[model samples]
Target: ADFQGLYAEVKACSSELESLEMELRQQILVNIGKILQDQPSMEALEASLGQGLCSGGQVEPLDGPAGCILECLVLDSGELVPELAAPIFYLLGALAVLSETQQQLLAKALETTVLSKQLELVKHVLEQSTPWQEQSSVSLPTVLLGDCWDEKNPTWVLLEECGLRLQVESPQVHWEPTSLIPTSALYASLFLLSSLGQ
Candidate 1:
């Protein structure tokens, strides 16, 4: 009941009790961000963030914009932990990543949250997936050098023309597809945030 603050609000109005257990379960997803903010040590509950955030997070709208507004309003994620990162997730929950720079920030914040890929986005490119093969017909994007006929695969472009002097090394962990073990809410939140961000 205590955890279910807004959850109680909805339940109080609707006599139909679906599942208090699940209602409260989803309740934590929205509030967890603030909980982590007020108490950063909550990062120890990294796995829980995903469950509360994305699992039932979508089914239950937030009591308000507490989760979304805090995206840019509160502290940003520095140390890789649920406590530190929950805020960023809430940010993504409330914001949109329209640029390479914003995407990079989201990637870093979610580095440890999801699969080995860390954040599910273009973390890196320009890797040697195949041997050098010069294709005379090869045409690099305007961002890439036109004369560059280096052998490239189908190419999953993460960053193209960012003025960065160096490449942003993606996480060293295994790919997110295989590595993401228990993060339904985190995963779902990513999908939902993308749609709501803009």
Candidate 2:
């Protein structure tokens, strides 16, 4: 019987497959980080991400960058990589600029259960009472003046409250100041919260 040769071949093939998967995962992480840094406009973000992240080189109908991200999120024993969450949330926050329909597609890509848990996680983070260690010198009214979003939305209300709290607690600085939380996390959380409008 050739069972020994067949077993060896199967094992080797699986090893190669694993190697390829690891490479792809690393590439996805690098691509997502690059896209975040580029901060392409709302119209361009998804396309850019799809081109960069997916091997197919275009946004797929049922899966694309968002799908890749969600896959990465649950990569190991269902425990998310802590470092990965901020960047992902920031990117998703940027994607929040999309139209409701498009945003729904992105949400669909991530799936509702995952999206809800993420929202809850960020909501919990923003709602914490711990004061900010640093702040911006700009007044809330100045920042809020040009901003336009529905006040009736509870998520909006939460975001507004969190933003105000950050301003209240952080030290005044002429330029962008440090905060108790990562800048991306706060901004992303705010963006995500704002986009939860019905």
Candidate 3:
């Protein structure tokens, strides 16, 4: 009787999970439609793409099959053909430019030498790529942001051309710290990873 009860509970939970997943998928489709309608400009599309990438956060090895599946989906071909792809890539290039500028202003907050080294690394990577104008043919969306959840807090990683910023949130509050990697390097890294996955 106990075994039968446990099996019944499992079945019921699975049913509920399937229902929720379907609802979430529908909601995502609707949200994407709304975003496309409301934000047709290059600037708006870039913001939306950034928000979407960041919303997924980070995937850990321990996350197993689920993590692999998520990574595959995030870097899939569908992202390449999406109407928002070009604007998103343009936004990434723009972000790289902004990050370089931000680094100059926040120089006092971190080590200049280390920051410069990071920026150089980013530049070298970006230089290897075809010019942004030539890259228009490639349709893949770069994953620029990521998030992860822990027992006590959730963390967000925002990647830009100048560098990446990590924000940690707990029950009480949130904290964000700037990193050394340049935004250019971050974009290059993302592009490289996506290419490898393909």
Candidate 4:
């Protein structure tokens, strides 16, 4: 008898569960954005200190702001994990905005996590593929590997591995007409990010 009337309560509770999850995710993004805004450029920081900040009179530079924030986030216990996909995309957005060196450092710091998640995204993207239908473009994971665009970054390395594996396993359909669309878009976005100084 109790089970008969439980459907409405179950649906309502599940809705609230998702709502809470969304709020928590948005809060994480907000805190990261605040950190980015509050951080000062090295030149501005030095000027604000009136030409000297250390006893030696030659100031040592601090960690690049993006790298510092991302390093602490990744290294700290639970802030960023491969299982939570949205935060990885948020991290990628931050990575996309920073200098090349900062991007590389953060990528190096979170290499395992980012690469794991990229592989997951790639699997999902490929699983949904069909020769008859056009596929949506997936860019977030790809752009996270933007800095090196080659073996220097493990994510790009993963892409190369996926490429070779796909070619060997499905040589007939690997180059299906629709497939090239996404690959071209992928490369175009990589080139765009490169030339735009992102």
Candidate 5:
């Protein structure tokens, strides 16, 4: 066996794998959008979003037992639920970036902190807001409340400012980890939009 030839074969295999992955991702998004067209409510939307993943299948706080059942049905396998996949992957990326202690801190903050408290903080941030500047081209930050992060888009600047305002009001929420959730959620939502054949 020639080692050089074997190395080239491995490289070719890796390239093919990447290509196939992209193709599958595109197909998944198309299918997901088609599925979403049928869903009527927020609950239905959430159910459709997670359709086909397991292990990480837990009902979100706002969801009830029926919603939990729907979530389980939707997330039956990781292969089919691309919406859930993106957010989970984001959390994984965040975990990779944060130290073990920081990860624990994030978990603790999530457990102790209420969404109402966070909302209050967000309210205060908005109240202190400055008008958008034309020369500086600064607008009030838009608040994206899920798992997406779109740094390249000008709109994300507003999102970041909104986040900053929230952090300033509620220092205990800890800006780094708390902010990651919405940023990541925004990215996921954008991903869904892009996947709609756009």
Candidate 6:
């Protein structure tokens, strides 16, 4: 065995592998400050976060968690407290700078702070699950709504909450601002009842 040649090759290979892992991990993490320090960078990340849920690419962590580039950008998973809570930390920072609640409220949305359908789906789910004291009528709809099968992602798939069971004549209510009311004589009008009716 040529000891000098073999050792050199092995050492060089090990060094290269170490650097590769480090670089990958660094890319995975390295903080949103890298992303947020500049406005154009934030906008670039917004575009980056938009590329998802549509089954476009594989293992594309760049867009992240339903589509949260901030969480994706900073979180390297099992890395550190800073990484784990970057979104909250930065949000708190934003909130800290603002003078009032309403300013803080629409602040992120004003500039198109992107979150994902997947993240949005489970966001309401988690809030609803916060209490076990009562049965929520929304449970099944939430399950079905959140059900974005692996094939149907990032695309805009809307979920309608229609409890199909007949009640003993419930009152008509159309929750506007987004949700359409039951309206007029038929509660069934709120749903596509033609196919369901015998």
Report lDDT (Cα) of residue 155, candidate 4.
49
Residue-wise C-alpha lDDT for candidate 2, range 1-198, written one tens digit per residue: 232443343334223323334555455544443333333433254453334344323332224444555455433444343344334444554444433433333333332333443354333343332233433343222332223434543333433433333323222112222332333343353333323321
Give residue 167's lDDT in candidate 3 (0 to 100): 30
Clashing pairs in 2: none
lDDT of 5 by residue, 1-198 (tens): 332343343334223323334545445334333333222333343443344344454434324332332332234342334443434233233333433333333333332323233333333332332221111112223253334434433232434532432222323122333444443333333322232222
Q: Candidate 6 overall Cα lDDT vs. reference? A: 0.28
**Candidate 4 clashing pairs, residues 3+ apart or interchain:** none
lDDT of 3 at 191: 31
Worst 10 residues of 1 by lDDT: 128-137
Error of 1 at 3 (Å): 31
- For each candidate, what TM-score against the reference? 0.21, 0.25, 0.19, 0.21, 0.24, 0.20
Model 4: per-residue lDDT, tens digit, 133-179? 55333333434344544445544443443332232221212323334
Tens-place lDDT per residue, model 3, 1-198, is: 222343343334223323224443334323322322222332444444455555543322213222222232233432322322333343234334444334233223131233333333333333332342232111111221123332321112222323322233312111112322244334332332222222
Each model's C-alpha lDDT? Answer: 0.30, 0.37, 0.31, 0.34, 0.34, 0.28
Per-residue lDDT of 39-126 in model 1, one digit per residue for the tens?
2223323333445444433212223334432232222331223333344444333222233333433343332332223223322211
Once superposed on the true structure, which residue ranges of model 1 sit more than 4 Å away at CA?
1-173, 176-178
Clashing pairs in 6: 53-153, 53-154, 174-181
Model 5 scores a C-alpha lDDT of 0.34
Q: Which is the winner by TM-score between candidate 4 and candidate 5?
A: 5
Name the better of 1 and 5 by lDDT: 5
- TM-score, cand. 3 vs. native: 0.19
Position 175, candidate 5: lDDT:
36
